[model samples]
Target: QIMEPHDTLSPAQVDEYRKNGFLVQEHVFDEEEIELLRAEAAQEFASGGERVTVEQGIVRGVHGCHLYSEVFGRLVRSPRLLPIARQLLRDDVYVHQFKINAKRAFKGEVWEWHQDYTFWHHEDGMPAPRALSAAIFLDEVTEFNGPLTFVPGGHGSGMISLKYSLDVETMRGLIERNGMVAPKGPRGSVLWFDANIPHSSVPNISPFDRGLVLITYNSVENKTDVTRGTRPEWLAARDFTPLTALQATSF
Candidate 1:
C-alpha cells in the first residue's frame, strides 16, 4: 500500500487491524470532548429516543443515540473519524447502528458473547460484514471495569459464522485456541474493530462507570433489506444515505 502524505492511520496501524481484527488508538479524544460526550450520553440515556435498557432495574445500555442526540450525531460524522472509517472500509459508508454502552459502577450488566455480524446479517438482513465500529471511551477502562474482550485474530477465519452467544465453556475453548485479550485504556481512547469480530464485555461491579459510544459504519453499498427483520427502526436503521464527509475537528 502506498503511504499518503497525510492519513489518519500509519501503514503499520492498518496492518495491525487486518492481522488482529481490531485496533485501539489512545487519546483520540481529549478530556474536553469526552466530557461533553459523557454529559450528552447521560442526558440522552435518561431521556433519549428508545426506552433505556434495564437489566434488574439498573441501566444496561442505550441504542440509536446519534438519532436522538446532537453530540452523538456529530461524533459519528467527525472529520477525524470519517477518514479512518473510509480508509478501513475502502469505500463510502453510512451509519448502520449507533449505541451508547454504559456499564455503570457496581450495577452494569453483562453483554454475553456474540459477534455483531450475526444480528446485522440474520436480523437486519445486512449482506456482509463490511461494517466496523469506532468506539470512543468516556471513562477510564481498567481490567476490572469490564472492558471489551476478544480473541486475537478471531476474524481471520474469514467471516465469523455464529448466530448465537457462546456459553462459558464453548467461549473458553475459542479463547484458549486464539488467545484472549481485554484491552484497557484511558478515557478518550478509540478502538476500531470489525463487525464480525467475536467480542463481549462483562458487568462492571467496580466503583467506576465505563461509558462508550460505539458507532458502526456500513459500506454505503452494503444496504440492508429491512422487510425480513422485525426489530424496531431506531435499533436497526432503515436509512441507506451515506454519511457526509466533514472537516474533522472539535477534539
Candidate 2:
C-alpha cells in the first residue's frame, strides 16, 4: 500500500481502483499524441485487413494493432502506462491483447453487456481473472457518442452466468441491482478496469466519433494454454514475453 516516490499512481488512486473496479485518469496524453494515434487508427482501419472487424460496412474495430503498427508498438511500452499495470497487478505483466475500438459518428455498433473474463476463461482457458484493460480515448467522448457503461463494484459480485449478450429483461434486472455509470471525457484520458467488470456501450448517434485503444494487461504468470485457445493469434496472443518500458514517450 506504500506509494513510493517514483510510483506512477498514488496510494489513494490504487485504493480507489480496488474499491470501484475501475479508475479514470484524465489528460494522460496530450492533444498532439492523441492526434497522431487518431490518424494511425484511421489508416489502420481503412486498409481493411483480416484483423479488421466490420459491421454494416463500417469499421468497428481492429485487433493486434501493436503487433503490426510501429507507433502502437511504442505506445504499449510507454513508461507512463507499463509501471501502473505492474503496480496494479502486483506482478510483472505482458500484453494479453490489444485492439482499437472505433465508434464512428452515427454508425457505431452496440457492444452487449458482458464481462471480458468470460471470453478469456471459456475461450482462452485463462485460469483467473487477473487481467485488466487500459482503454485510452482518442477522441472526445460524450454521452451521445456511446461511451462505455460499467456497473459499479460489479467485479466484486463474481462472474454471473448468462448469455453472451443479455436480453432486455435480464439487463433491466441487473441494472436495478447495480446502478451503471457512463463516463465521458476528453481525448487522451485512460480508464483502467478489472477484467470481470460487466460493461457495454450503445451505438453512437452523434456527429463525433468515439475512438478507444484497448490494451489488456495480464500477469506474466497467468498465461493461457496455447492448445486450448480457439481464437486466432491476433485476438488471443500466444506470446508471454514480459514487456520492457520505453523511456521515450513518442507515439
Candidate 3:
C-alpha cells in the first residue's frame, strides 16, 4: 500500500523540490496533529533525555527523541512523512539523525552555514549525498523567527569545500553565484531539502518560538562508512536498518 499526498504538496510543488533541491509544503498537518506533536515535544524536553540540550535558556536541539518518546517513535514512521522521504531518496531510507531544532523566541542561536553531506561523509562516513532532511514545523516560521535558509540550487554545485565553519570568502563567492532564500510558512508546514545543500539559520529574536522536527534520512544502500574520527552514536547514528513507516491514525 502507498501513502497518498494530502493535497497540500502538489505535483508542481514536488517538481519544485526536484528542481531546486528544496520545497516547503503548507498545512501538511492539521491543528490536532500539530498540537499532539507539540505536547509530545514538551514532554520529551522535560524528560531529561540523553540527547536533549539547552542553550541560553532555550531548548537548542534534541537528538533521537523518537527512540525515547513513543509519540515521536510513531511520528518518525508515519505515512505522512515516509512516503515523501522514500519517494525523494528513490529507495528505502533509514534515519541517520532525528533532531528537534527549537528556535526559541529571543534565545535561539545561529547555526553556521555548512553542508549536511559533509558531516555525514566526513564524520559519519556516508559514501555520497544520497540523503535529505525533512523538517516539520511545530510552530510558526516567519522572517523574524529563525527560518532554515537555503542557497537555491546549491545541491547542483555538489559537495563544496568545508571547514570548521565555511569562511566568509567562500560564502561571499557562493552567495554571489547562487542566491540565498529562506522559505517561511505557518505551523504544520514542512520543508524538504537535500542533504548536500548549503543551509543555515539565524537566532530567533522574535516573540514567537519557531520549532521544528528534523528527520535526516539516508538511503539504505548508502549507509555510513565511518572509519575515521570517533563520533557519538547518539548524534551520528550507526543503524542501517531500513525504516518501516507507521500507519498513523488521522487526528
Candidate 4:
C-alpha cells in the first residue's frame, strides 16, 4: 500500500522496470511526508525496546503495531506504489515485507554482496518475475554514506549463490562474474528492483547516518501465508485483501 496517485508510474516507466529489473523514482515524496516518517522513526528509536541491528541501526517491521500509525499506514498503501505494481506485474500484488533500516555513521558495518532470492531457493525454482522490492531513501545517500550498490540486469541471469565459505580470492572471482555499481542519490529516491538482483552496501564513511525504508511485493499468484509464514511482518500494513484476492483469482 506504500503508494500515492502522484507516484503512479507511466507505461514507459513500467517498461523500464521490467527491462532493467529495477527503477528509481526521484523525490517522489514531499518534504512534509518525509519529515513525518523521519520523526516516527526517531520516536521508535527513542522508545528503545527492540534491539535488532544488522550493522549499526535498528530495524522495524513494516506491519508491526507501530507501523499501524497513520503516517506509516498511508505510505504502505500509497496509490503510487500499488498502481505501478499492477502495471509491472499485470497481476494481483501484495506487500511481502517491509523494513526500516537506520545505519549510524562511522559504524564499521559492511554487508556482503548477495541476492535476496538466494534464501528462497526452496520455494522459488527460478527467478520469479512476480517478486520485486522498492527501496526508499529516507535520508540523503551519498557514496560515503553507504549507498546501495547493484548489478544491472543481474536478476535476468538467474539466482547465483555465493560460496558460503570462500576465501578472498574466490569471493573476488565470484563478484567479478557480475559487475557491480553503486547507486548514489538524494533523499526520497526510490529504487524498485527485482529480488534476484545482486546488491550490497558498504560501511558509512561520512559523518552522517543513512536511513532507508524498503518494501517488497509479490504477484498475488505467488502470495501464500504458507510460504511466507503468518507473521505480521509478511502482511501489508493496510488491508490488501480485496486486491490480493482479485489477483489470486485472475492467476
Error of 2 at 196 (Å): 0.5
What is the clash count for each candidate, in the order shown?
1, 0, 2, 14
Write model 2 residue lDDT over 1-251, tens digit each, in one string: 23223338889999989877899888889999999999999888987399998885778889988888888888888876889999999888888889999888887767888889988888988888898999999988889999999987888877662346556775687689878998777889999999988899888999988899999999989888888898887889889989887763233
Per-prediction RMSD in angstroms?
4.1, 3.8, 3.0, 6.2
Cα lDDT of model 4 by residue, 1-251, tens digit: 32222346778987777666678888877777778888877665554354233332444222232244545555655765666676666776766556677767776466677776655343433235467777778878887888778776667777662332125563465457756667766787887888777777777878887888777766776554354432334333233352422122222
Candidate with top lDDT is 2
TM-score for each predicted model, relative to the true structure: 0.89, 0.91, 0.89, 0.75
Q: Give the TM-score of candidate 1.
A: 0.89
Q: Where does the lowest 10-residue lDDT sum fall in candidate 4?
A: 242-251
Better TM-score candidate (1, 4): 1
Residue 140, model 4, lDDT = 83
Q: Residue 117 lDDT in model 1? A: 85
**Per-residue lDDT of 58-126 in model 1, one digit per residue for the tens?**
566688887877777778877668888988998888888888888888866567778888888888988
